[model samples]
Target chain A: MSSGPRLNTDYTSANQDSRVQFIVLHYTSTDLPHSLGILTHGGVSAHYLIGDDEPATVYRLVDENRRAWHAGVSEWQGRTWLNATSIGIEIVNQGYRDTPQGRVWYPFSEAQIQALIPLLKDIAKRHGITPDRIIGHSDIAPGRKVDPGPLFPWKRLADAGLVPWPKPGELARRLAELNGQLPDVRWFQQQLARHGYLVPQTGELEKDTRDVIGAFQMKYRPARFDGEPDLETAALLLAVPTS
Target chain B: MSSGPRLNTDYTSANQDSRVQFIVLHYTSTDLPHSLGILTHGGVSAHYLIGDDEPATVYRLVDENRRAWHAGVSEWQGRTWLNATSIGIEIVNQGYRDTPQGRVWYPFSEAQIQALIPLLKDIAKRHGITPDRIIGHSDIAPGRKVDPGPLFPWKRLADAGLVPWPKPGELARRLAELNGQLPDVRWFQQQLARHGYLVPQTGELEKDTRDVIGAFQMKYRPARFDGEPDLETAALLLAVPTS
Candidate 1:
């Protein structure tokens, strides 16, 4: 009988806050054409995409206000299914390939990182998103995916004053304390959880925990990310800012 | 040191469409105060919330253009992680309670539904969402969720032409043919998937399958929604329009 619901915007609740909590970064793992095609039409999407061009072209695929079909089955800091509460930014890069010698991972262009830093800062500024919440895709969906891989410089994010860097002094001090003796797997699992990864606390270096450890190592100590629980990874986990 | 990324909006790709693909409905299993507090300050949120007040007050908490954290870890058809592609509407209702003798579910007020119909139609019209795409929370996350439950009168939605109804004649004919002979669980699972449910086709009425069947029963046939694979459920499954 009626035309539409009676509209009401009379009252504003003060307790509400911005829905954008985390910012997830990823790589297309393909060329720009494929990236654009897949992001726009091929069932998955991201809020923005930076092309692997000379100066790096930034494409706003989906509006920040809208959810993008990236971060599939992802979580961060205990919050599962992240697309609704985060903005996803995909960068164009051929992720990695295994060769005769070893698996070769691509490097993000200086232009892409340069382009990405300011954009990340801008989004973080607007939504009050902390550097800790600005995470790589691998951080959220650890065992399932690894993107914006080891080569993607998280250091630049730290350099830009957007994220925390594990201080050399702190790492040195922690390494001294460990004295080549690594913490048990249970300690590693608890520490990884503390560092914002959804890890199994089963205390064994099983596949799930190994994958999570591998993801952490890929981000913090990428030189040897074999998922082996060692002192360096343990030190980095301790040195990294949790809050 | 550049200020920001090079912006490029020079070309509009004709291949892309609106990120929104589905409209999911829910019931706040609590009263107005708790619902408001929880939906706002609490972790979860929705695009809209309609109160059970007289003349039903429709509150637009999150803008339609933005994603709301309502549908968590949900799937429909083959599309997993649905919050990125759907709009969620939460209605104020104290969902259901198990009593001494039986389980009792609450009914949505006519005012709320009257207000809800127009809003659903408006969202569907703007996004070009088909009736089948306008679904209940239970439909998307079966076994985990059962909101806007059986008493919520999906028949009114069918009457309002917002969703497809099982044709009475077709159902009767199907029932007669079934003649006390119900289809196998695999058939039911496949049909439910065809009707946009993410069901397993294991051919056995396992917990997951049973839960999914119960969700379907809750929607199509509210009476005796015991999760049993019965003759009527099979007939309704056959009679319902898919796509």
Candidate 2:
């Protein structure tokens, strides 16, 4: 009997990669108490939670060992239902209110961002979490979910190298080359797929595809995401895959 | 602007344990080809697959960095919806075929166990998984799943200190003192809850309660799991909390 701990370092690549693969950011659609109620009592949860309340409290609601139901029916990088191999961070910011004039999204406080940076960095370092892999809930579950919305500041996190950000020069150059018109639907679909959106491969300018593009725009462009296949959206899509 | 990588290891934990915590064991209730078809095509997936065909091949179907659709609507140790914090391992073994002979279940072959042991050891080592933390699919989704069933040599893994085991001597001692009748429903419920089953303290012998007891019986006392709170089962329950 080969007893004692079977500690073998010699392993073939035929093992599942369960180390921290992705980190998802979500704006907890409500205040601390409401978020806490939903997170703790409701059918959902998150690993770490940052409240937008004064003093910017960070609550480690659920440990990594516990599956918190923050991300529901999500997909990324061809992997659907992402609750298994992802870490969810729920920020206690009242998401947004849509209006005819446009959506009035709340700005995440500076103190909350400050608390989140170190937490993100620590989680990243510990898990070897790549910049490209760290994404918003919108990025993974484009259609149904959209927390850590456009106002959530992907650039700041990207500035610190926590998530991937598009280049203005590349986007501008591409936009000019396209002559103010958008690329074909297939091109957009392919680009979104490559950039890790679970978009359909169909060439038609479909609703699902538009929602994915909108999700991308929400993260990168942020000014507007009306799901139009515009020049700016095309340029933004191109910048992500190449970068 | 801190560029390159926003890496920080001000961590109170190991890297692998943060996002990837529990390793759940499962038995694919079909042949390798059928299991592959379902695992690949549908919403269900596992990080690693060990097939029971001749020679017992191991397939790493999903990357650890990607979420595999396994352990649906599950909970463990007060953590509900456990897919987020756990890695699922599926073993192809045609599970069981029920007949008049009181549900004649198939036993996991020695070859299958051999392939599984090293993989489990490596996974445990890599993820810094403790004995109690490395659980079965049935353990996580008790009433719903009975996979990686009673035939699985949990005792062998227990011998390697990969999983927890009840002390036979202790259980027998307690069993004799308690006799056969059994404790109250609240007592059983509390014990199950304490041992990490999402059971309710209804003080009634409901189906849910019985199933939880049966799930426990399947793990600790495999020979019998009729959901009855026997003296032996009670003893087993007591041993788990202390040991």
Candidate 3:
């Protein structure tokens, strides 16, 4: 009830003990009121929620320093139970669905993303969250969930220095001189893991592997959610430093 | 009537134009009988079909020296109209569907993949298809098609030296190091594209990008399809050399 952020009422004891390191973003997949009911009263909650309307309201359900229960059954890097180690933010929006047009529909408001940036920046700085640790629900669950689908503007965040974005023009020019195509799957998988994704290199294109790619897309190339690896994807992937 | 692996009936005409460079693999979502009907009579055909129960059959719908109508509306390594330069091989399987357990289901026979190796090797040698050029339907149509889904064993083919498989024990070590954290998407996309998947560096996690990830997964992970760019996925993606 205080003017400051709300602490997790259910896990009040762990709040002080938990150390937040990651910030995962998600779309509620429902309207504002419905999502509010689920997050607040239905035993599901996040650290923050940004609404879709103009002048988006940011409800701090859990304090920035405390862990939130948004990331369930999730693993990233080498840690599991991310709910205790990361801050979770939910944005109000209906997620992807099979439309007659053969595309996933995502109606995220600019105002919402815009309003959420300052809050994210503040929390990120306070908790020492790196730009690379910022992720989406779809990224964390590549093959299954697609909330905050391709329509989410990650480049905008990167442009504003909130996240890491690709430098395509530079990459294209650099790749033009290469030969013998790109390296193999093992190589890509290693790089993916080094950067923090939970990709397993089975030396074959497998189902779970595709989910990892989907998660990558959710953050880097959200326009087309095709799970195919391509020259462009490979090139961009290699450009990033593993550390 | 002549059964010893003759070219497609239409091969004589199509072959005079060009030689095959790409070999695209797929799975028939329908049964073998239906697949045979559709392939032979329905104007949709591939160069080969490896049945679940029966031995692999080479239909040669189009000549290996000629373009086949297999890769439709697809892209890889900045090339389009892959059917004009690729050979299409259809593996007999049910393809993928949503299961009651809320997971995507794909069932492929071990014999089917085993039978495919010799045929793939034969074709690769005849047409000089590199290990990287041998791609799945999902690879080209990352956002749309996912034939020959994660159930297919690409690593087996790689192990036989038909394709490039990851080194033994390399992937396990990499996965062990991932601490359950999401990887950077831009870097992963670059690596996928560089590895010849149809991914582009859009700098935002777009729908098509996710499709590319799924396509890569179908060939690499095949176990869990969460779409999150976790540590292992990132490592595998990076293990591949972009240059």
**DockQ of every predicted complex:** 0.19, 0.07, 0.01
Please give, as one word, the docking class of candidate 3.
Answer: incorrect
Model 1 chain A poorest ten-residue lDDT run: A9-18
Ranking by lDDT: 1, 2, 3
Provide the DockQ value for model 1.
Answer: 0.19
Q: Considering chain A alone, what is the TM-score of candidate 2?
A: 0.88
In order of appearance, the predictions have TM-scores of: 0.71, 0.54, 0.45
Give the Cα error of residue B163 in candidate 2, in Å.
Answer: 1.2
Shift of residue B57 alpha carbon in model 3, Å: 79
Off by over 4 Å in 3: A1-18, A177-180, A241-243, B1-243
Tell me the interface RMSD of model 2, in angstroms.
9.4
lDDT by residue (tens digit), candidate 1, B1-243 = 756555666433333345577889999999988988788778888878899898898988776665578888888766656665688899999999999998899888988988899999898888878888888999999989988888988888888888888776999988998888878888998888898888888898889999889999999899867789888999988888885
Measured by TM-score, how close is model 3 to the native structure? 0.45
Tens digit of per-residue lDDT, candidate 3, span A119-145: 778877776677877777766666766
lDDT of each: 0.83, 0.76, 0.66
Cα lDDT tens digits, model 1, A1-243, are 654565666533443335677899999999998888888777788888898887788998776766677888987777667776788989999999989998899888898887888898889988888988999899999978889898989998898877767875998888888899989999999998988889999988899999999999999899988799998998898888875
**Candidate 3 residue lDDT tens string, B1-243:** 432212112101111111355678888888877876676666566766666674444344443433345676876665555654567888777776677786465667666776777777777776667887787888888868877677777778877776656676767666666656656778778878788776768767777677777677667776644455667677677554332
Query: lDDT, candidate 2, residue B207?
Result: 93
DockQ of 2: 0.07
- Of candidates 2 and 1, the better by lDDT: 1
In angstroms, the error of model 3 at B102 is 57
